Design a protein around this ligand. Structure first.
Ligand SMILES: C[C@@H](C[C@@H](C[C@H](CCC(=O)O)C(=O)O)C(=O)O)C(=O)O
Ligand SMILES: C[C@@H](C[C@@H](C[C@H](CCC(=O)O)C(=O)O)C(=O)O)C(=O)O
Lengths: 423, 422
C-alpha cells in the first residue's frame, strides 16, 4: 500500500482510498498538500543561485528576503535569526547559545538548563537531554534538570486549573532554588507540549513561569516546533499564552515541511550578548540554505497573504474548538477534551469521575489509533492521549467530515472496550 | 559585491568578475556549479510527492531509489542507511548508535568515544565534544582525545612511516589508560579537513584498525569531506585501506544542492541495532524525499559521468603532480601534500628547521587575503593553505588556478620580506 498524492488535507493511496491527514504530516504541513508554487520557487532558486559563498561579505538575497518577511510576522525584537536544517538542530544551537550568552556576561557557572518531564525537544544528544521522555533517558548530559509537567488531569489533585497553574509553575522556582540561581542558565518549554500529548497548561502557568525566570536572572526559551507558524491562531504559541521568551526555536513548519529547515530566533538582549562574544556571527550572517529559504519564504508569504493564520484565529480555530468539544465530551471513556486554534486533543480514561487512567498507559491509545487508521483518518496517540493538528487550511466542511469519522471510530472504540471487559 | 552566477568551477559577481572556487563551496560541490538538471529533479519530486506518511508502512520511492544506488557505490556490507539533514546530525546520530550498540551487547559501560585534537565532526554539542578543536572546547562525558598524526610538528626524528606507527599507538595508550571495557569507538576523518588537510602516514590507519580490533572497539570513519570522490575513491577510508563499522556523510551526498547527510551502517552494528529496535523507524522512514531525489541525481552523475573514476585515474594524479611542482620551490612553503582532489601546504618560517610562524593563523590569513584579492578561493586553516575544487575541473582549469596561486605566493614572499617577517 503506497502513497500516491496529497492535496489540501487529504492523502491518496495506490488503492484509491482518500485519507484525512489530521496531523498535517509531522504537525507541520500547515498550508496543506499540493503547493505546486513551492516547487516552482525551489526550481527557480536552484537554477539561478542555490549557493552563496563566504568569499562575499553579503548574505544570499533569498535569505535576506526570508529574514525580512519573518521579521514582519515574528514578535518585536527578533530580527536576529540563525537558520538550521531542522528543529533538532535549532534546539541544539539554542543550548549552545544560552550557555555562551552567560559566558559573555561573565557568569560561566550559569549553565544548567531546566526542562520538563514529558517535554520533547528533538533528537540530538543535547535535545534529548533537555527533553523529558523517560524512555529516551548517558542521558541527560550535564547541566540539565527537569521539573514536572503542568498536566492537571494527573497532578491537579483538588486544585482548580488556575490554582494548579501557579503551583506547577512554582515547581520551577523550587528547582532553581535547589540548584542555585547562579548556576541556572534557562528554562525551556513548548507553549503546549506536543509529543507529550497536547498538554495545554492553565492560563496562570506561563505568566508565573515568566515572573520566576525574571526574578532569578534565568533566560526563558519557547520551543515553537509545533506551535509555530499559526498553529494556535497566533503566529507563535508564546503569543497566545502571553509570555515573552528571550529566544525561540522553530522547525520545518517554517516551510510546511516542503524542504528541511529550522531556525533560532534570538531576541534583542541575548543577540547583543552573543554578537559581543562573536561565536555565532558567522551563522547570523551566512546561515540558511538558499533553496530551503526560498521555499520557506513562499510558505510564510502564503500563511500571511492568503489569510491562513488570521483565519485560524478568527474563524476555523474557534469552529474546530467548539465542534471538537461538542463531538467528544459525551463519551464514557473520553475526558480532558482540549485544544487551541488548530491543535486539539483528548485523553482515553478508565473512569472520568475518578480521573482514573488505564493501566499500561499507551495500550488503549494504540487500540483507538488503529481504529482511526482502519477508517482512513490519521490522528496520533501519545500514550492514551489522542491528538490532532490538521493543515490550517482545513475548511469547516472538512472539520465536520473529520469529526464525523472520528465520532464513528469512538463509538466502535467504546463498544470494543466493553466487549473486551475493559470498560 | 554579490554573487550572481556559478558554473563549473567558477563563480561570478555583480562586476562580471570570474572567481575560481578552489574549495567547492564547503568542500562539497563535487559535481560543480550550474547543474540545472538537479533543479528539475527537485521540481519534479516536489510537484509529485514531497511527503511520505508513516501511516503507510512503506518507504518513499525516491528514498528507496537513492539507497539502491548508494549500495552500488558503497563498499560491500553497508545495507542500512540512516538519512539525516546534515553531517553534523549524522555525527550526532552515530554517537547514539555506537552507545546503543554496546548496550544491546550487554556492555553498558562501553560508552566512551575517542577522537583527536584538531579533528572536526560538526557543530552539535555531541559532535563538538568528539571533535578536538581547541576553541570549540565541552566535551560532554564519555569523550576522549589523542594527538593528531601531524608529522611536520610531532615527528621529531622519526620518518613519516615510523611516526604513523607511534601516532596510532597513542590510541592503544589511551584505550589502556581508560580501560577497553569503557571504550565504545574511535572516530576519525580519513584526512583531517578543517584541521588543515592533515594527511596521515601510510602506516597510520592500518595500525589504528589493528588496535581497534584488538581491543574490541568500533571503528568509525567521518567522510564529511573525503566522501563522494574527493580522494579518487568513493570514500576516504577506501583510499587509506581500512574497513570501518560505520561511516558518516554530509551534504557532499547532494553536492550541497540540498541539505542531506547519512550514517552508513555495516553488518555487525546494523544487526545489533536492529535487535534493539531504537533506530528501526529511521532505517525505514528517514530521508526527505526531495533532498533524496537531488542526492540520487548527484550520485548518478558522479558515477555515470565517470567523475569519480576520473579523479582516481586522470585529474587527481595531474593535480597532485602540478600542485607539488608549483609550490615546492617557495622558501616559506613546506609539507606540500594531497591525494585525489584534496591538497594543501603549510606556510612556515624556516623549512630547514621545520619552524612554524608564531601566532599560527596570522600568516595563513595574510596569504588567504592575497588569494581573495586575486579572485581565487583557497582556505587557510591556521597557517595551512587548503584546496578542494569541484571534481570536474579540467587540466586547463587546474593550471589556471595554479598560475594565479603561484603569482599570489610570489607576492606573499615579497610581502614577508617587506614586513621583516621572512
Ligand atoms: C549549528 C548546527 C549545524 C549546522 C549544520 C552544519 C554546518 C557546518 C558545520 O557547522 O559543521 C552541517 O552542515 O553539518 C546547522 O544547520 O544547524 C548544529 O550542529 O546544531
Ligand atoms: C536524528 C537527528 C534528528 C533528525 C531530524 C529531526 C527529526 C524529528 C525528531 O527526531 O524529532 C528533526 O526534524 O528535528 C535528523 O534528520 O537527524 C539528530 O538529532 O541528530
Amino acid at each position: 500500500r503506497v502513497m500516491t498524492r496529497g492535496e489540501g488535507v487529504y492523502l491518496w493511496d495506490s488503492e484509491g482510498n482518500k485519507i484525512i491527514d489530521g496531523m498535517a504530516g509531522l504537525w507541520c504541513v500547515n498550508v496543506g498538500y499540493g503547493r505546486k508554487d513551492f516547487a516552482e520557487a525551489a526550481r527557480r532558486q536552484m537554477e539561478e543561485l542555490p549557493f552563496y559563498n563566504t568569499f562575499f561579505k553579503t548574505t544570499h538575497p533569498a535569505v535576506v528576503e526570508l529574514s525580512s518577511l519573518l521579521a514582519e510576522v515574528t514578535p518585536a525584537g527578533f530580527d536576529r535569526v540563525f537558520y538550521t536544517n531542522s528543529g533538532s538542530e535549532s534546539v541544539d544551537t539554542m543550548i549552545r547559545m544560552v550557555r555562551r550568552y552567560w559566558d559573555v556576561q561573565g557568569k560561566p557557572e550559569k549553565k544548567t538548563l531546566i526542562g520538563r518531564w514529558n517535554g520533547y525537544h528533538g533528537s540530538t544528544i543535547g535535545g534529548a537531554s533537555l527533553g523529558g521522555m523517560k524512555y529516551m533517558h548517558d542521558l541527560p548530559i550535564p547541566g540539565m534538570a527537569h521539573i514536572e509537567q503542568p498536566w492537571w488531569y494527573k497532578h491537579g489533585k483538588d486544585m482548580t486549573p488556575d490554582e494548579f497553574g501557579v503551583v506547577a509553575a512554582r515547581w520551577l522556582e523550587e528547582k532553581i532554588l535547589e540548584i542555585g540561581a547562579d548556576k541556572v542558565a534557562a528554562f525551556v518549554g513548548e507553549p503546549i507540549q506536543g509529543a507529550g500529548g497536547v498538554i495545554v497548561p492553565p492560563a496562570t502557568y506561563w505568566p508565573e513561569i515568566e515572573r520566576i525566570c525574571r526574578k532569578y536572572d534565568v533566560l526563558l526559551v519557547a520551543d515553537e516546533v509545533i506551535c509555530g507558524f499559526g498553529r494556535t491562531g497566533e503566529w507563535f504559541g508564546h503569543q497566545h499564552f502571553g509570555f515573552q521568551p528571550d529566544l525561540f526555536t522553530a522547525a520545518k513548519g517554517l516551510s510546511s515541511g516542503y524542504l528541511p529547515i529550522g531556525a533560532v530566533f534570538v531576541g534583542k538582549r541575548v543577540a547583543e550578548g552573543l554578537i559581543a562574544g562573536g561565536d555565532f556571527n558567522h551563522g547570523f550572517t551566512y546561515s540558511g540554505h538558499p533553496v530551503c529559504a526560498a521555499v520557506a519564504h513562499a510558505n510564510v508569504a502564503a500563511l500571511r497573504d492568503e489569510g491562513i493564520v488570521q483565519r485560524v484565529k478568527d474563524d476555523i480555530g474557534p469552529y474546530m474548538q467548539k465542534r471538537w468539544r461538542e463531538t467528544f465530551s459525551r463519551f464514557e471513556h473520553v475526558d480532558d477534551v482540549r485544544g487551541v486554534g488548530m491543535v486539539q486533543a483528548f485523553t482515553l480514561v478508565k473512569n472520568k469521575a475518578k480521573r482514573e487512567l488505564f493501566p499500561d498507559f499507551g495500550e488503549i491509545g494504540t487500540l483507538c489509533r488503529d481504529i482511526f487508521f482502519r477508517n482512513n483518518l490519521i490522528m496520533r496517540a501519545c500514550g492514551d492521549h489522542i491528538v490532532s493538528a490538521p493543515p490550517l487550511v482545513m475548511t469547516r466542511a472538512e472539520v465536520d467530515e473529520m469529526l464525523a469519522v472520528a465520532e464513528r471510530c469512538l463509538e466502535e472504540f467504546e463498544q470494543t472496550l466493553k466487549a473486551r471487559g475493559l470498560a
